[PDB]
Design a protein around this nucleic acid. Sequence first.
DNA 1: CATTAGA
DNA 2: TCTAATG
Length: 327
Amino acid sequence: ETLNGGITDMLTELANFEKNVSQAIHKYNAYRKAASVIAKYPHKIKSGAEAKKLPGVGTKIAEKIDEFLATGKLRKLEKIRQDDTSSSINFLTRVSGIGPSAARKFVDEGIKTLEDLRKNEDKLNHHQRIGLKYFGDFEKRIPREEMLQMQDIVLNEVKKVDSEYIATVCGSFRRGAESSGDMDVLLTHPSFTSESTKQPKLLHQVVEQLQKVHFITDTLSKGETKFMGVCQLPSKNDEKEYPHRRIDIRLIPKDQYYCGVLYFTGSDIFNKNMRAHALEKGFTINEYTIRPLGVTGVAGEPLPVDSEKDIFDYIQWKYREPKDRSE
DNA sequence: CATTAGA
DNA sequence: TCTAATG
Ligand SMILES: [Mn+2]
Ligand SMILES: [Mn+2]
Ligand code: NA
Ligand code: NA
C-alpha cells in the first residue's frame, strides 16, 4: 500500500503502456499480475531477486525492479513519458468516444491534438463528435449542489409521464459525495420484470420528456434499456450558463431493482465486502439478484427482494445507509 | 461484462 | 457479424 506501491506504480505504468500505445496484450497482462502480487507481498522488496521469488515475476520484471531500486527511476519509464507519439495517444483517448484503437489510428493520420481533431471533424464519429464538443465540460466535476438540482428535475419529469416509475440516482452521489462526475439514473417500472418481454417505450418515454424540457441535449447512444447522453441545467437569468453533464439512464426489471441499486451505489469496496459476507451467510450476490447456496458447491434460486433491506435482512446484516457504504 | 455503434 | 467503446 505504501511499502510496495513504488514497484506497483511503475508496473502499471509499464502495463498501461504496452496495452495502449503498443498492442502487447500479453506483456500488458504480464505487467499487471506481477503488479498485483507484488502488491500483496508483506515486505519491502529489497531486490529484483527477492521479488523474483514471486509468481509471474520474471527475469524481465526483476530486471525492472533493480533499475528502479538502485536508481529511483527507469529509463524505460523516462523514454516513454517523453514519447511524443506515445503521449499523443493517451491524450486523445480522453476525448470521449476514443479508445486505444482510435487513438492509434488517429495518430498515424497525424491527428495528435484536440485542434487536429477539430480540423478533421469528418473522420470523427457522433459519439466522439460529442466528446469533442464538450471535451472541457466532460472532464469537469459535478458539485452535488448541482447533482441535487439535476436529480430533482429528473424525478419530476420521470413522475410527470407515468406515476408508476421508480428512479434512483446511485453511486457516490447517493453515497453522499461532495462532487460527482456523472449522474447515474437507475430506473424501473412494475410493468417490467424478468420475463414481460420488454417495453422499449419504457425508456423512450422519459428520454423523450427530458428532451422535451431541455435537460437532455444530446444522445451519446440511445438503446432499449440504456440511454447515454448529456444534459445541462438550465442556465439561469444569465451571466451564468451551466456545464454539459454526462447522464445515464437505464431500464431495470422491477424484479431486480434493489440489487443493482445496492450494487451500482458502491462502494466497490462496500459491495465486495458484503457480497463476500453473504457467501458465508449462505448466499450469492450479484448485480441482479441474490441466490442461496447449495452445499453441492453451488446452487441457485433468486430470493425475492422489495428494498435494499431484504438484501440486508437476507444476509442478516446491519442496515447500512448510503452515506456509510464507504467500505 | 454487458450494451450499443458502426462498418 | 465483429470489434470498439462505455461503464
Ligand atoms: Mn466510438
Ligand atoms: Mn456512469
Ligand atoms: Na517467479
Ligand atoms: Na475515451
